[PDB]
Design a protein around this ligand. Sequence first.
Ligand SMILES: [Ca+2]
Ligand SMILES: [Ca+2]
Ligand SMILES: [Zn+2]
Length: 102
Amino acid sequence: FNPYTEFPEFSRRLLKDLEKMFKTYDAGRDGFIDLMELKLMMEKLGAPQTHLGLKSMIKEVDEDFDGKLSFREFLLIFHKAAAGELQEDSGLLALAKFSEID
Ligand SMILES: [Ca+2]
Ligand SMILES: [Ca+2]
Ligand SMILES: [Zn+2]
């Protein structure tokens, strides 16, 4: 996985910022953000989600079908947001907008 060829529209600064955010919320430090971690991220960001809402969020970008978020799938969230691909009511969009990244 190469984030520079995969997401060429992301500056180096933005990549690091997102790496910083991913690491912040991977509380267990296993390299993934799972439903429990994502629950705590949405609470902290001011956009708390229901348990099925959080499952729906992950599902949207869970390209390896494992229930949790790899870094690349995390980045994919922000790609979609910046490309106009998230619905206006998506918790993923609340994630991107309330990250105060950018
Ligand atoms: Ca984790
Ligand atoms: Ca996954
Ligand atoms: Zn469940």
